[PDB]
Symmetry: C3
Subunit: 228 residues, 3 copies
Amino acid sequence: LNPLSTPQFDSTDETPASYNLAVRRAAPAVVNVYNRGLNTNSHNQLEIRTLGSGVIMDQRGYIITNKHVINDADQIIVALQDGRVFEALLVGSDSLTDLAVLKINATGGLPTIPINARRVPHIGDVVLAIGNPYNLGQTITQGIISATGRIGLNPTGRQNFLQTDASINHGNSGGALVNSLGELMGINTLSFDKSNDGETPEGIGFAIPFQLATKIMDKLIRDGRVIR
Amino acid sequence: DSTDETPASYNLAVRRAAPAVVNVYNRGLNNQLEIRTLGSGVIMDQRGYIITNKHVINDADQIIVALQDGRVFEALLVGSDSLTDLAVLKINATGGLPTIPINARRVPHIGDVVLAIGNPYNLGQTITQGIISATGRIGLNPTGRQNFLQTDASINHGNSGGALVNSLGELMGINTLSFDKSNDGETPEGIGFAIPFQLATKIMDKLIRDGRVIR
Amino acid sequence: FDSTDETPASYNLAVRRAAPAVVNVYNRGLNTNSHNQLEIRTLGSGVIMDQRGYIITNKHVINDADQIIVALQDGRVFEALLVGSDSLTDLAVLKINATGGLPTIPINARRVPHIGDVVLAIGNPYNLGQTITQGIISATGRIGLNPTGRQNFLQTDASINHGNSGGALVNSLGELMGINTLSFDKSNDGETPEGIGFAIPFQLATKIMDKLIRDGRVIR
C-alpha cells in the first residue's frame, strides 16, 4: 500500500455563514418527549396528552426535561433524532425549577449534550434553541441571550432565568439552548404565550441555566428528590 | 455607492439577490381591478422567467409584477403545478433582468444563516433573517409528501413566492407558507416553509418546456 | 472535540457599549388608589444622549403622565422632566438631574444603516427588565406611498414588544442606528404580523432633540 497520502479534496465554493457546527455537536442529544395518558373516557388507549423535548445528559441514559411536560404521564416516550424510540422511567422532579429527570435503557451508545462547566453565558451571545415545536420534528431556531437573570422582582417571578429571542413554541419545553459552539447554556421552559395586557409576545422565551439544571439533576438521581 | 462594509451585515447577500425578487399582484375585476392577493416572485435565470407560488396567481384576471427598480409589468402565465404549488411567469420587458444567484452544487444545511426576501403586507420589499431550522419537512399540512426547508426567518402574508437565500445570496428556497395551527389560542412563531431550490429549478424547466408537469 | 478554547459568537461588545445608556421609562398614573405606589399607565424605554441627562423617548410613551420615572440599568431611579415633544415625529426629550456621571449612547455621526445590517433592539418589553433582541435592518425608508404612511422609518425584524418604544436600535459596534417605535401588531386581515418593527433614524432623532432642547419645541 502506497505509504504517501493522497491529497484531500475540498469545496471549490465560498463558505456560507452557518451555525451548523453547533447543530452537529448538540442536536443529536436533544430528544422528543411524549407524555401519553390512558384515555379513561374511551377504551383506555394511550394518546399524546402533551409533548416537549429533553436533553441526554450522560451516556447512562439520564435525560433532563420539564416537569409540566411529564406530569401525570401514564407512559413517557423518548424519541432520538437517529430514529430510536424508548419508554422512559421517571427518576424524579422538582417543582421549584420545573425540571424532571428521566432514565432510558439502551443497548447502543447514546449521544450526549456538550457541556462546558467553565463557560459563562453573556448577554448578546448567539444561541440556538433545539426542540420539537408542534410535533413537526426537531427544529433549530436562532436568537441571542437577551438577559442572564434579574436583580429586581419581575413578572417571571424568578431571578436566574436566561431570557432569549430564539423562537420558542409549544413543544420546545425541556429542550436545549446552546451557544454557537454547541455548548449547553440552558433548558428551555414553557412558552410565554399571552401578556397580562393581552398582547402576543414575540421573541420572549426563558431557560433554566445549565449550571442549576445539572445540580438539580444530580440531586434527583442521587436522592430521587430535591432536599434543601 | 461607497458602501460602508464595517458593521456585521448581510448586505452583500441583499445587494446580490434582492434586485431579482419582485412583488407579485393578483388582480381581479370588481367595478375595476382590485388586488385579490399578493406575494413575491424570483427572476430565476438569464431567460428572465419568474418563479412564484401557484396559490399567489390562481384565478387572477391580471398578474402584475413590480421590480425593485420601479418598473411595473404585466406578467403572463407560462404554466403551473398544483402538486408542488409552483408557477412560472414571463414579463414583456426587454432582456437583461437581474437574476438570483444559484449554485447547483450547494446543499442547504441546518443552521445555515438565511434571508427571506418578499413583500409582507405590501410594505415594500422586506429582508428578514433566520436560519435553516430543518429539512425534508412535509409542511404545515400533515398529509402531504412534498419536501420543504423550514426556517425561522420571519415570513408573513405577502412573502409567498419570494426568495430564501444564504449569506452568499445563493437561492436556497422559494418561501411558501407559514405554520399557523394553534393548540389553544397561542400564535406559532418562527415556523415557515420553503420549496428547495433544486426542486423549484426542475419544475421550472419542465413548465418552460412542456407548459405543465408531465407525470 | 474540545471547545474550551473556542469563542462563542456574540454581540456582547455592542451590549456592553450601548445598553447602560438605555433606560426604562414609566408613565405613572395616580388615579384614586395609587397615590402611594407606582401604578404604570404606560411603559417604554429611552436613550441617554448626553452627560447632562437629556434622554430621547417617544411622545406616546409620556403622553398624559402624572409623573415620569426613569430607571437606569445600574439601579438608579430618577424623576424626569419633560423638556419638549414633537407630535410630527412622535419624539420627546426628558431631562434627569443626577449627582453621579451618566452613561451615554455611542453615536457615530458618519455611520448609516444598510439593509441587512445586524441590529440589536434594547428596551423594556412587558416590564421584564432591560432586554436585548437581535435582527437585521429590513428596509431603510420607503420611496413611495405605503401602509406606514411615512417615508423615513427604519424597518427591522429584531423583536419589538410593548415596552420597547423609545429604546435603542444599535449595530454590531454598539452605535445608535435609531429609536424604536410601535411595531406592526395586527393586520387588517386579522393576522398577527411577525418580525415587523419600526424605528426613527438616529440622524433625524438627534436633529429633533437638539431643537427641543434649544426651544422646548420645534420652531418652524
